[PDB]
Structure formats: C-alpha cells, structure tokens
Amino acid sequence: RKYFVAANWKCNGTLESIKSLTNSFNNLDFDPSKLDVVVFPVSVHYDHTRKLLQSKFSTGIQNVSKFGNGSYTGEVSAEIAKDLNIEYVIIGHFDRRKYFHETDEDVREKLQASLKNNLKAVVCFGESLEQREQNKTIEVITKQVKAFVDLIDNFDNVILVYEPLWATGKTATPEQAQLVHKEIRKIVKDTCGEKQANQIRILYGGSVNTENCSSLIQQEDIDGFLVGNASLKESFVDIIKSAM
Amino acid sequence: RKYFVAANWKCNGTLESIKSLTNSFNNLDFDPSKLDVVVFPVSVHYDHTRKLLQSKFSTGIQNVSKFGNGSYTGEVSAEIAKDLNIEYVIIGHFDRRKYFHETDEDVREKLQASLKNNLKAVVCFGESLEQREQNKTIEVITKQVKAFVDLIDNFDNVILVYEPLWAIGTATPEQAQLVHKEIRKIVKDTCGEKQANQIRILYGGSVNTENCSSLIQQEDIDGFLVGNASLKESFVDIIKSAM
After folding, report:
1. Secondary structure (3-state) at B38
2. Subunit comment for this entry (chain B)?
C-alpha cells in the first residue's frame, strides 16, 4: 500500500499565508510515485493553491455536492470538479456531519457522484464519545462504512479515514487506532473482497502532529493521515517525512 | 435608489461556457457608478469568472459560512471572502433553505459575519404556496425579515430579495410590486423611513428578457436576482432594462 498524507486546511487561510506555506512545502523533495501528498484548501483558494504548489503535490476540495448541475445555489457538483481537474474530494468529514446535517445517505450519494465523474474520494467516518462509552464502536463503524463501501469500483481511488470523534479531553493511542483500522479493513474484506481490503488505504484522521505522526503511520493498518491544524504549519513537511 | 441586476448562476458552468458568456457580458457598455451589476459564480469558478469579467461587473459568492475561521471543513468564512476581495454574498436563497436545512437563525448569523467583514449581502426570503393560500404572505415575510433586519447599519450594503416560492412550481409584475411595497413598509417600521427608502429590494422570481421591463418599472422593485436567464448571452438585455 502506497502511503497517503493529506492536508485538510479546513476553513483557514489567506492569499498571503498560502503563498508562504506552499513555498515552504515546495522545498520538500519527495517522489510522488512513492507516496501521495494531497492538499485540500478552501474552495475559493483552490486555484491559488494549485498554481503555487509544484506538480508533485496532489490537490482536492473539502466537500462536493450529492446533486449534479442545476438549481443548488452554493453547491459544487462533481461534474464541475471534473472540468477543473480537481483530483480529490473529502466526503463525510466530522465537521459536516456535526454542523450541516450530513447523513450516511448523503455520504453514499456524494461518493457515487464523485466516482461517476472520475474523482478520487477521501471518505470520513467514526464514532462519538457516547457511542464508544456504550461499547458500540464496531456497530457504528460497520454501519457507517457499509453505507458506501459497496460502491467503490477502484481501491486506489477511494481512501478511508477513521476520525476518533470520541477523542472531548480524550486522546487515542496508536495501539487503539491500529485495532480500529484492522477492524475497518475486515469490514472492507467481508463486503468487497480480500485483495480489495489489502489494497485500500485507511488513514487516521484524529489529531496528528510532528511528534505522534511516526508512531501512528508505523502501525500495520494505518496508511497515512488526514491532518488538521498541523498541516497549516511549515513543519507539516516533517509529517510528510514520516511517510517517506 | 441605484438599480441592481444580479446573475445567480447556481450550480452551473464549465470553464469554457464561462469564457464564452463573460466575453458576451463584457460587450455591454454600462456605467457602474449608476448601476450595480453582480455575477455570482460557483465558488471554484470565482477566480476564473473574476479574471474574465471587466471590473464594471461586481462579483460575489452564492453562500457564506455562519462561522469564522476554524474547523468548518467545506465552508468559506466571511474573513476569507474579504481577504479575496469578494464583494457580495448571497444569503438564505431558497435552494439552501430547501435542500440544506438553512434556518432564519443561520441567515442572521451569516449576515452578522458578512457585515463584520465588510461584505455586502444579498438576502433572500419569501413565502410558500401553502402560506400564500392561507393568506399569510405578510406574516411570513415579517418574521423572515425581522430575523436579521436589526443588524443592518448601512442600507446601501444589504440588498433584499423577494423570492415568490408560491410560483416556483406565474406572479404578475403588479403582484410582485405589492409584496415589495409591504417589505419596504416592514423595513420602515423596524429601521426607519430614510433607511427603507435607501434599501434595494430585488425581485427573485422568474425573470427573463420578456418580463424584465414590466418588473423593473414597478416603484418598489429595484432590480432582480436572476436564475436561468442569467446563464444566457441575452442576460445583457435584462441588464439593459435597468439602464
């Protein structure tokens, strides 16, 4: 499995900060055939970000519409992303499930729209603190994954992300994350096949920084990360280095 | 009041179609000091659209976040829009109220964020067929407007849009006018007379080359937020009706 390190900038950035951040990123000499490195800027920052990053960096957007073109003011269709050659989309991120009523059905639909339009999708899921404390981790994750997993038609083109929502004051250990990842891979196996499960990249989408990154990626079933705030720093290159 | 003609492209366009359309738009010689013309492309099309359109055309985005910067994956904050010199935002469009559960509270918060960041806001509202049939037009519009209206400090910078949802699946210009006059009365009694006479109120129902003149002529209709007709080169004729 090819390692996959992603920068989810979330709702952050200015033209000036992106200029200097991309410049520092460009200083990192890495081979894009040996690892995927994907930067997800804000929609309106996409062109700026794409032009400033060297070709070795892949790029994507943080959300995509479940609808095609039409009367959906404020939405970006998968067809539009295709026309702009936007390579990757994030689907089902915690933020969108939490604040924007995004459901498992929405996730399924968004993945389908993406795949129909040759987009690659980074799909997020994970259980809450209440769900973990009630010992429902596997129940919840199985439900969330089975909501979309049968639609994957290429196991390099869809990447899974485990978000430990429960970790609130709590922190997930690499050992705990590894076990969840192992369990996700088995769900993929039971539903899609063994070769398919061995092929699919499963990322850790909890808190990742320069300190913990190596302990996480060195776990057998953790194939990379979807990084939050640490990816807004020049030191993000040291996180990429853990995958090199 | 300065007339205000706006193109809501909604979720439509390719790089090629925008190139062709903006070029035809650029052929229209109008004075931006006398008339406001605003194009609202898809977020990822904004840079493309802004670079192709002559500066006489103002530009904006079709939605803005109710939150500031931070962990709001997929959102565009008012501060990001300001940093990019995005002049206008659409808030509360029917599509977002219908498909994305946007409430009156969301509308208020989005407006507060927009104004704090010196953005100009195009704010949409309007009643359903059921509400109209129940004779609740004024009741519904009063509640929707009062959700946000107290936030307005500069009445050049917030633009109201009446969306006749009851028609969206045929309003006469007079019927539109009557609602617009009621909206202006609501603004007068909540914000003052000077302010109500200042504020632009656009018609956001179905606007085309054939009806635009009859609509703009109405005393309390100050322009349009245009849908499908704004994806065509003949949108220039709609702009001309306000010249």
Report:
1. strand
2. Homodimer.
Cα B81 from Cα A74, distance rounded (Å): 14
Phi (first) and psi of residue A194, to 5 degrees: -75, -45
Q: List the one residue out of B35, B33, B78, B34 whose CA is nearest residue B60.
A: B78
The whole-angstrom separation of Cα B25 and Cα B62 is 19
- For residue A27, the tally of other CB atoms under 10 A from its CB is 9
B83 in A contact zone (CB under 8 Å): yes
- Intra-chain end-to-end CA distance of chain B, in Å: 13
Nearest C-alpha neighbor of B149 from the set B175, B177, B182, B111: B111
Residues of A in contact with B11 (CB under 8 A): 65, 67-73, 75-77, 80
Instruction: Specify binding-site residues of B for D-glyceraldehyde 3-phosphate.
Output: 8, 10, 169, 225, 227-228
Long-range pairs for B218-221: beta carbons < 8 A, 24 or more residues apart: B218/B173, B218/B174, B218/B176, B218/B177, B218/B180, B219/B177, B219/B181, B220/B177, B220/B180, B220/B181, B220/B183, B220/B184, B221/B173, B221/B176, B221/B177, B221/B180
Q: Which domain holds residue A192?
A: 1-244
Nearest to B221 by CA among B164, B169, B146, B167: B164
**Residue B163 catalytic?**
yes
Contact present, B126 and B94 (Cβ < 8 Å): yes
| Number of separate domains in chain B | 1
CB A217 within 8 A of CB A238: no
Are A13 and B80 inside 8 Å of each other by CB?
yes
Interchain CB contact of A93 with B (< 8 Å): yes
Give the CATH number of the domain where residue A118 resides. Answer: 3.20.20.70
Inspect the interface and report whether the beta carbons of B47 and A44 lie closer than 8 Å.
Answer: yes
Phi, psi of B124 (to 5 degrees): -100, 145
Residue A231 in contact with partner chain B when CB distance is under 8 A: no
Q: Which amino acid makes up residue B82?
A: K
B9 → chain A, closest CA residue: A73
Tell whether A113 is within 8 A of chain B (Cβ).
Answer: no
Nearest to B93 by CA among A74, A102, A178, A128: A74
